[PDB]
Structure formats: structure tokens, C-alpha cells
Amino acid sequence: GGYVAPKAVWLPAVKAKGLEISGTFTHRQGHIYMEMNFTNKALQHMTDFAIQFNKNSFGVIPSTPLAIHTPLMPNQSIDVSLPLNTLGPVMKMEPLNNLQVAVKNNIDVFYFSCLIPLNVLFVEDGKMERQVFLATWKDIPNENELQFQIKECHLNADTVSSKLQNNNVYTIAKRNVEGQDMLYQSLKLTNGIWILAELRIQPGNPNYTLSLKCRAPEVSQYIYQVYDSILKN
């Protein structure tokens, strides 16, 4: 039971000759999926479907041929599921998490863009052995620490750990000092990078100070973003 973004219109009919695409990525038992839904708003039929992914920043690629065996009918809307892995090729994309994508059919080829939510790149063995979290924490130079402000979040010490848990942010420790709880937490990217976090929760204060330490800190701004999304949703 992870966090999944609603379907977003990746490629609207008006652009792909009647082919319309709704999308969302999912992580389930550390296996990535592009959840689509195809709709032929056109008046031809659609056979010969393939999807191709551009190089991206986490080697993200489709792992099968697109799963679609019938022609798609004037008006038929159907769910696809595209399994993905990350053993694919790599190019620093900007935004770091952008997916440029070619979908094809008998009619033509439509290029469109969608953002991978990073959360679905959190592996399952991302919980740092406790020695390992501390040593690492002091290791990575504070120069290297970013801090974010989880604007208006109010959910408990206990509710925080558990959401992040489904989305594979694992709480290492929860300490309280002058009244403020401080969740010590770790996650890890499919490509191997650790993120370490200290979430700090106040008595009263509507915000939630998030601090990330990370070997490559360009990632951090995104972890923020989707810790955010989780905690809001």
C-alpha cells in the first residue's frame, strides 16, 4: 500500500490524433510500474503500439514490449501497465526526474512528457543499519545538508513514521528534546544513493523542519517535494 499520484493526462487526444493517455507511476514490492490508460477518441482504429523511453537520470526503462494485443477501438478506454526497471542507459536530465517518452502506433508517434515521482524509486532495503546511520551522518559534511520546511503539516510523530514507511522512508530513531520530536530517517534510491533525514516536529508550530543529508544533494530538493506530497495526502 504505497502512495500513488492520481492519473494525469500525459498526452491529450488533441496532440496525438485522438489517442489520449492518463498516467501515474507505482512502486509495489519494489517493482516499478507506469500505470497508463489509453483512449481512442479518434475514428480510425489503433494497432502497432510501442512505447519508448528517452535516456534519463535514473536509467529508467520499460522492461517488456507494451502489453496491447488488440486493435484499440474508436472510444474504447483501457488500462495498460508498463513494468520498468532501472538497468537502462543514463543522461543527466533536467528536471532531474523528467521522462521524455515516444509512444507509437499505426497512425504516428507522439512525444510527451511526464515526471517520475521519486518516491517510486525508493528501494525496499533502504533502512540504514543504526551504526551506519550515525557514522554516515557525521561523515557527510554539514556544508552538504539541506533543510526544508514542511509547510502546514500536523500529523503525529506516529503518523509520520508510518506513511514514510509505506513509501520506504524508514524511521531509525525518534527522540524528544526540549519538547520537540525528531524522527531520524533513511531512504535509498534505485540507483544506490542514500538520503538521510532528520524530521523535526514542534509543539504547536505548523511547519515541520526537514533536514536531508545526501552524497549527491541535488536529489534532496525532490525528496522534500514528495515527503511533502505524502504528508499532505
Partner: peptide
């Protein structure tokens, strides 16, 4: 041991 350092090290970053 481990317990301690986390309090150690929390307290400090408060």
C-alpha cells in the same frame, strides 16, 4: 552504545 549516541546526537542538533 547505540541508543546513547542518538540521544547524544539529537540533543546536540538541538
Amino acid at each position: 552504545d547505540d541508543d546513547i549516541v542518538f540521544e547524544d546526537f539529537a540533543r546536540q542538533r538541538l
